[PDB]
Design a protein around this ligand. Structure first.
Ligand code: HEM
Ligand code: HEM
Ligand code: HEM
Ligand code: HEM
Ligand SMILES: O=C(O)[C@@H](COP(=O)(O)O)OP(=O)(O)O
Lengths: 146, 141, 141, 146
């Protein structure tokens, strides 16, 4: 992940103000709502027939903090998002069969939930280091696929 | 949008496929499984080994829908609605994968239709596949 | 394909941009240039620096076409005819870029309309931006 | 890129049989025909109004040989494509202003020309290695863009 320290110090400093709970819950539900086909992996979660049935579901919610939960930790190893994610890599592939593209989709919803939330503070330049971050994540989550 | 020559071009390359469609659909699918392994995530319940008959049976399925689209080249939206319903609401196949399989299809024909796979005819088939993938993902959201 | 909830939702968000649509067209361009540097290969003639006039004026051009798509939500094809032509035959931007700039328009919106950028408004704008992108690149070949 | 040795052998033995002069002309020309917008860079090459005006244009035929000879030389450096292509990366960025996605268009168009020419010999596993090689080049070429 080609990050400048400027870029990293920017990333790290914003993250620090993240409520993972609410941001991971909002991030996974916008995915389920914006790109409705990602829903194929959660029918067991319940009713997802509406933005609100979706937004409101505890399952999506708790699956959001869980997912954002592990995002938080790779930010701790931006220098090796490949070995930080290897196991989660083979489980996504080998057990859950998730197409890595969904990974790209989430990164993009993430970046829009951060903006949503930090308005004025998530600047062209802060957005851009973040874009490098969710693309190194998608890529490290995606690299043990076979 | 398919022009009169795209149609003519596709009516003609597809016409030589003739009876190998199935064979060829099966090959398009292995090409895809191997080159773009992320595509196997949709066929977890399949056997994805060389010559699996699940593969041979799925390929012909695919090849028959192409063959039908070709035959209804003037109404593809209706000809395939049924397939779009399916893909939009039950398989929920990320759009990106249509483009990878259309490419393994172009490669397969290229490889079997030496003679017919002209620049002009390559172009037509590319637009062709692209409009069948567009029809198929039309009801996604 | 915009449903009536979709168009309603885009009419609404868009109404709130009002007067800043240009301000936002320009920072959408500025986020793109920085997050997706490759997009820069199309503006080699522009000063791309912060607060450039070129970018700012370009921001408004684009904002106004968006606006003009909101108004003609039911006739984009015709509302945007001149523009697809411009993009397909002269500019020739590679289609993949339409999605990078759509995404920067989303961020920008999100960051400036927190109360209204709800999940369904978000989903709507997204489908919007996707069909204007499809209309721009509809005559590429 | 990360190719098996059974993958770098296959790449290499085939490549062995390609006529680069004529395969560069055929892959560059099929590009300007199937992805017409790609002509944006070749205005000075003359008439490209029709498939035969493009494919037979002697400037198209002579540029295609430059491109693949270059492509051919990174085949000797599979373990160092970034280094191999870095001055051409900067050339294409800095001076020609070529959107890198052009580069992924041509690797695919290259993959269909090989199939076209080797027939049955371009098997599923030979294609999958070339798919790797071409993505390596696309990326190596796009490395230094900024
Ligand atoms: C964006 C980066 C992502 C990260 C870091 C991530 C992380 C996780 C983690 C930490 C788990 C818990 C696994 C366990 O029990 O050990 C998980 C499970 C799962 N993830 Fe991912 N996730 C990501 C994206 C996605 C996306 C986009 C999808 C699909 C839309 C997805 C689908 C799943 C599914 C279906 C499970 C199984 C949940 C269960 O146990 O029911 N993940 N993920
Ligand atoms: C041009 C594109 C495509 C065509 C014409 C096509 C056509 C078909 C047809 C005819 C079926 C059989 C349905 C039946 O049982 O009646 C099917 C099923 C299926 N397709 Fe597609 N498809 C296309 C693209 C894709 C892509 C790109 C993928 C995944 C990467 C995909 C994944 C599936 C899956 C998982 C099934 C379920 C089959 C089974 O379990 O037997 N399709 N498609
Ligand atoms: C939402 C999608 C887009 C819309 C509504 C849009 C709209 C416009 C408008 C309204 C113009 C002004 C033409 C005139 O009257 O002079 C224009 C020009 C232009 N567009 Fe687009 N555009 C879009 C996507 C793109 C993308 C993604 C790029 C490249 C990454 C792009 C590159 C250009 C360039 C280079 C110009 C001309 C610059 C100049 O000579 O000022 N456009 N576009
Ligand atoms: C894909 C691998 C490619 C390689 C190895 C390659 C190699 C080259 C070489 C060696 C040159 C001449 C450098 C010089 O004059 O110093 C060149 C020039 C050029 N390249 Fe590429 N190229 C590739 C792809 C592309 C693509 C896909 C495009 C765009 C469609 C493109 C557009 C250009 C242009 C426009 C020129 C300059 C022609 C002129 O006016 O002389 N190249 N390339
Ligand atoms: O992800 C990659 O492309 C790299 C590295 O370098 P960066 O280009 O990420 O700076 O390892 P590779 O995947 O080629 O084996």
């Amino acid at each position: 992940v080609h990050l400048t320290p400027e870029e990293k110090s920017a990333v790290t400093a914003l993250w620090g103000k993240v409520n993972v709970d609410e941001v991971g819950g909002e991030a996974l539900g916008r995915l389920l709502v914006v790109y409705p086909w990602t829903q194929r992996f959660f029918e067991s979660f319940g009713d997802l027939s509406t933005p609100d049935a979706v937004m409101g579901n505890p399952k999506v919610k708790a699956h959001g903090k869980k997912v954002l939960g592990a995002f938080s930790d790779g930010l701790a190893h931006l220098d090796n998002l490949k070995g930080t994610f290897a196991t989660l890599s083979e489980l996504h592939c080998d057990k859950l069969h998730v197409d890595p593209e969904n990974f790209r989709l989430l990164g993009n919803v993430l970046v829009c939930v951060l903006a949503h939330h930090f308005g004025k503070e998530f600047t062209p330049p802060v957005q851009a280091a973040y874009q490098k971050v969710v693309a190194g994540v998608a890529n490290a989550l995606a690299h043990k696929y076979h | 949008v398919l022009s009169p020559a795209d149609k003519t071009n596709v009516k003609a390359a597809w016409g030589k496929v003739g009876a190998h469609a199935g064979e060829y659909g099966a090959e398009a699918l292995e090409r895809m499984f191997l080159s773009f392994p992320t595509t196997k995530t949709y066929f977890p319940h399949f056997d994805l080994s060389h010559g699996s008959a699940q593969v041979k049976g799925h390929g012909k399925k695919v090849a028959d829908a192409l063959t039908n689209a070709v035959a209804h080249v003037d109404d593809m939206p209706n000809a395939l609605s049924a397939l779009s319903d399916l893909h939009a609401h039950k398989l929920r196949v990320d759009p990106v994968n249509f483009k990878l399989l259309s490419h393994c299809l172009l490669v397969t024909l290229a490889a079997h239709l030496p003679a017919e796979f002209t620049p002009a005819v390559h172009a037509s088939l590319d637009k062709f596949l692209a409009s069948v993938s567009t029809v198929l993902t039309s009801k996604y959201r």
